[PDB]
Every structure is written in C-alpha cells, then in structure tokens.
C-alpha cells in the first residue's frame, strides 16, 4: 500500500509476522527508543532453512507498507544491520544469519535455539542520514506512536504473551508493555492499561438500528436486512469526569486488525459527547464482518451507513439512563 518510513510501521509489520508465524510469545527489547535496537523474539513456526535467502525477496495490513522493497525483512536490510536466528520444528539446529544492506547472507552459522525466530534490527536508518536525523530528533512521538500501535496488538491478542521493554543508555531495562496470554480482551485491557482503567468501562451491547435511526441514515426496512456486522469490545461510561481528556486510547479493529476507520471513530465520540461533552472516550472496538466487504482506495465497507446506524443507536442504547 501505502509506502512510509516510521518506526511504528516497522515494529508493526514484525509483531504480524512473528503473528503469522503462529508465536504465542512475542517479546520485543528496544534500545535508545528503538534508535539503537529493535529486537523481536518469537516463539512461532521458524524458518525452513529452503528459505533463508528467500526472507529477502484483501489485507488490511496492506494500507501502509514499510521501506522501498515491499516487505518487512527486505526494505529493513537496505535501511539497518538485520541479523535473525531462527529454528523451523523440521530443522536439527538453529541458524544464525547476518543480512548486508542488499539483502544478501553475510553469514549463516549453526545456532542451537528453541523453534521460533528473533529478528534484529539495528541503527535502523542508518543508511539514509537525513531520515536517520529526523527519527532521532522526532522520537517521541515517533515513540508514542509506535506505542500505539504495540497496545492496539497487545489488546487484541488474546492467548498470546506480549512484552516489550526499553533501555535509554546502560541504564536499567524500563517496561513498556506486558500481556499475561489471558483469554479476553477485557483482561488484556486490565494488563495494558491497569485494572483501574477497566473501572469505567461498559461492555459493548449491540441492537438493532432503531427507526429513528435509521431515518437519519435513509435507511429502511430493506436496507437493514442484510446486517452482517458483528461489534464487540468496551467503551468508557458517559458519567462525568470518568471519560479521558482526548483520543489517546481508541483502539479500532476489523476481523481484529488494528486500523481506522474515520466515519466509525467520528461517530463514537461525537455520540459520546451527546452525553458527555467535555470528554473523549477509553474504546476498544472490534467490527466481524466478511472480508469480501471490505476495500480501499481509506478504509471502505459495503454498506456503512448500517454498520453506523448500529452503531449509533448501540451506542445510545447503552448510555442511556
């Protein structure tokens, strides 16, 4: 899709493969705010050793695309030192490998390590100084948006153990984040974020649109047949005081790929506001629908105005006294 240069499009693309690799650890040490290191380990299927040199040659996962060379490993070789251990269930013996900035093996030694892969990425940048300067002197938010990012995973991933930390200097390792491979969203909320924010927060309640609802949307009878959408997820009470001072955790997800969607996050927060005006809302929001629904040119869904109108009259439904 998309082609960007950020550190948060970067640590994402490896957190969906070690994802795709079927991982049920996911552990991530960073160094200097990724600056320095960037180091993502992973408990999933490895490598099959067939396709070592070949690691550098309707996805909503697609929007963005990281580097130059359409693919996580292979833009990150041209623009860091890339070295990856790895070990498939079919292989005797792990492998070691070091990657030039090509993509090309430097190096391939025997390294015994259990089935899984770590992917290291250091002096990301490097060999592009301008963008190299820019991402030093823009870390924070560079940083914090990358943040955002871990945390949309982190929620999502139920079952699956996910820990990141970051080291400034020889100073001590600082935590980040830390899932416990619990079994629902909402525990996955409480270890992100603390059991207090999990306080005030409702349970999502799907309806059916209501009529009033559905006039405002031109929405009829016929219209709200084919309702295929499926939301799930936790919102902050409308009570006073208990919503958040802006936008900083509102995490979307499609078929549980983080994303979003404009129309669907102007609409939640504006409902909100009807009830609590000087506040923004804590939300976690999963939207299950057929893929084949689904497009871009922006995320696109068939039939939208629904999804909202469900959403709307949802969203009224359970802030109402």
Do not use: W
């Amino acid at each position: 899709g998309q082609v960007v240069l950020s550190l948060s499009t970067a640590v994402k693309e490896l957190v969906e493969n070690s994802l795709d690799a079927g991982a049920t650890n996911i552990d991530l040490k960073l160094k200097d705010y990724g600056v320095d290191l960037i180091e993502v380990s992973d408990n999933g299927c490895g490598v099959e050793e067939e396709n070592f040199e070949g690691l550098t040659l309707a996805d909503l996962t697609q929007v963005e695309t990281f580097g130059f060379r359409g693919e996580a490993l292979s833009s990150l070789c041209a623009l860091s030192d890339v070295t990856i251990s790895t070990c498939h269930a079919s292989a005797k013996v792990g492998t070691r490998l070091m990657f030039d900035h090509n993509g090309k093996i430097i190096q391939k030694t025997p390294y015994p390590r259990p089935r899984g892969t770590t992917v290291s990425v250091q002096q990301l940048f490097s060999t592009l100084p301008v963008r190299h300067k820019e991402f030093q002197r823009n870390i924070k938010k560079e940083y914090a948006k990358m943040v955002q990012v871990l945390h949309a995973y982190c929620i999502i991933s139920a079952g699956i153990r996910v820990s990141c930390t970051n080291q400034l200097g020889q100073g001590k390792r600082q935590p980040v984040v830390c899932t416990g491979g619990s079994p629902s969203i909402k525990e996955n909320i409480g270890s992100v974020f603390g059991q207090k924010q999990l306080q005030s927060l409702i349970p999502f309640v799907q309806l059916p649109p209501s009529d009033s609802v559905c006039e405002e949307y031109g929405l009829s009878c016929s219209d709200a047949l084919h309702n295929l959408f499926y939301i799930s997820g936790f919102i902050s009470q409308c009570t006073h005081g208990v919503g958040r001072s802006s936008t900083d955790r509102q995490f979307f997800f499609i078929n549980r790929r983080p994303c979003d969607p404009a129309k669907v996050c102007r609409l939640v927060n504006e409902v909100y506001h009807m009830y609590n005006r000087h506040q923004y809302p804590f939300v976690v929001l999963n939207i299950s629908v057929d893929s084949e629904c689904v497009d871009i040119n922006q995320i696109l869904l068939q039939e939208e105005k629904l999804l909202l109108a469900v959403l709307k009259t949802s969203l009224i439904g359970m802030f109402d006294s």
